[PDB]
Design a protein around this ligand. Structure first.
Ligand SMILES: C[As](C)(=O)[O-]
Ligand SMILES: C[As](C)(=O)[O-]
Ligand SMILES: [Zn+2]
Ligand SMILES: [Zn+2]
Ligand SMILES: [Zn+2]
Ligand SMILES: [Zn+2]
Lengths: 329, 331
């Protein structure tokens, strides 16, 4: 209610500071980092790259990241704990479920998924005692039956704990609306929900409608663009053609519509990546050398150039994440 | 060559004894036992049940089991080591890949799959130093393109190390033939391959043809029969409608055809199971209270009553697993 759980323990709301609400130390799959660490060079190579990247972000103003890596995205909470300490940046760990649930997970019911999410929030992740401070879910272009089950369990978990829900959206079929519908069917308050990856579209009518219903809007893939890489069908299919300025202009567009309190901005960056083509991390790094420092080094000065008040920018990067992460019913 | 790697270390071929070549301590998914141990009551409860069942198997004559639980089936090699030590039963761990590879696995090349399998065979599983003694692969009714990749990687890993390959088959479209074709195209000897879940069909002609080519035949699901309960469609869809005696007669049939040296017999049992419906483990346990002791307590006596000679039954349970598991790159 006035404290948030991090991988180093509980902190006061005021200690969060500049917060990136959608990031990753490592994007992977369940158990993979432990079974084949040499895929990332080594576990130590990954730690070192991540510590280095978080220090760069820290030097640029970032105090806290929310790692929205879930069980099926290969979340390694011990990795998060080590990297948090070494880089001296707060990290909030996630529960929930992304788009790659294993057979065991796909066989579970809403009540079983709720119990799993609650365990990671209320008791801790694995045998670490480290508690989730956020619930991450995801749907495809069209939501599948199992995805709905995850969203219902997430709502049930949120209603029992006050922990907020962040979503992954994709495609053209306005996924956020499908999700919002399920959430409200479970009686979940929109103010507890961040509809993520919303900068992926230029449909401003879609975002304002969601915001007008009280939903937080996640503009979290700002640096993700092919800044001179069309000779990679893999990149264009997982990055895009809209420049980071185009994505950044949605932030100001929503501000101008009166929704500054509903905006959450992030990089959706990572330091290791195994769930796409080999070495794609190198391609991402070539495009955005700033890493998680992209938002404070590039996006923030840009919005200020376009006339955005310091009061507003401070509110988006500090107040909004604080209000959102603070457990509330 | 003369040594097999177990979760407690290397052992001489001659120490393996009565070996069950297709079993599981726990059937799950990657990372699941560590993330939600309470699904199995507790990790501690799972250990206690596994030790209990392994000791009963040991009492009935079993000295070694091959745990063919892969990465994607949630293999926990530390769990295996712990139950092996407590029960005093050798356990051989697996590498390879079953039917549920994650997105990371599905994105990898044959080269990378091969390297991962080789890592688990040559250096160790995770950070434990425990090396895999078998490669486990699987295909569905109609083999998919990624499954082919996994089989090719397994062939390449086998050729580099001499470690054998065990397969999962399912469906009616003779998957073992699809598998054999891929292995041989990579240059793998059928003598390094056990085509598993072969007792799922009564097609004896399909089996003798495989055995004639030099393949080991895994009759590994003998107690998996839904006979005794018809009010469980989940149990009929995963177990069977044929009797265990029927499955066990396939053993005698293949011996009678002259293929005693190619036969590998097992229960394909487990002590925990999260891959299916909740408490499906309870259903299996009610059908087969003997667990992994089903083969030595029921199937071996049944075969003696069928007039299968003792020396033959011993060759199947002792000599055939030893020859199979012993790392071999002929000549
Ligand atoms: C690239 As993602 C769906 O793990 O934020
Ligand atoms: C039931 As199985 C495919 O894990 O032997
Ligand atoms: Zn996402
Ligand atoms: Zn993400
Ligand atoms: Zn199988
Ligand atoms: Zn099996």
């Amino acid at each position: 209610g006035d404290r948030i759980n991090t991988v180093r323990g509980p902190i006061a709301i005021s200690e969060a500071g500049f917060t990136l609400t959608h990031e990753h130390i490592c994007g992977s799959s369940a158990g993979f980092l432990r079974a084949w660490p040499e895929f990332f060079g080594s576990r130590e190579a990954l730690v070192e790259k991540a510590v280095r990247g978080l220090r760069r972000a820290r030097a640029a103003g970032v105090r806290t990241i929310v790692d929205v890596t879930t069980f099926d995205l290969g979340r390694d909470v011990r990795l998060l704990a080590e990297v948090s300490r070494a880089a001296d940046v707060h990290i909030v760990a996630a529960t929930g479920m992304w788009l790659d649930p294993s057979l065991t997970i796909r066989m579970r019911s809403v009540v079983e998924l709720t119990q799993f999410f609650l365990r990671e929030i209320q008791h801790g992740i694995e045998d670490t005692g480290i508690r989730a401070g956020i619930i991450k879910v995801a749907t495809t272009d069209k939501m599948t039956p199992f995805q709905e089950l995850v969203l219902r369990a997430a709502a049930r978990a949120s209603l029992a704990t006050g922990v907020p829900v962040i979503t992954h959206t994709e495609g053209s079929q306005r996924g956020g609306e499908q999700q919002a519908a399920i959430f409200e069917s479970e009686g979940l308050s929109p103010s507890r929900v961040c509809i993520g990856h919303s900068d992926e579209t230029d449909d401003l009518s879609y975002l304002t409608a969601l915001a007008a219903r009280g939903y937080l809007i996640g503009l979290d893939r700002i640096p993700h663009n092919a800044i001179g890489l069309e000779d990679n069908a893999s990149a264009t299919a997982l990055m895009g053609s809209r420049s980071w300025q185009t994505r950044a202009l949605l932030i100001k567009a929503l501000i101008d519509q009166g929704y500054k309190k509903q905006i959450l901005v992030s990089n959706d960056w990572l330091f290791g990546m195994s769930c796409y083509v080999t070495n794609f991390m190198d391609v991402m790094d070539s495009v955005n050398p700033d890493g998680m420092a992209f938002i404070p080094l590039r996006v923030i000065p840009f919005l200020r150039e376009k006339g955005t008040p310091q009061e507003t920018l401070a509110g988006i990067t500090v107040t909004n994440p604080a209000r959102f992460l603070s457990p509330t019913l």
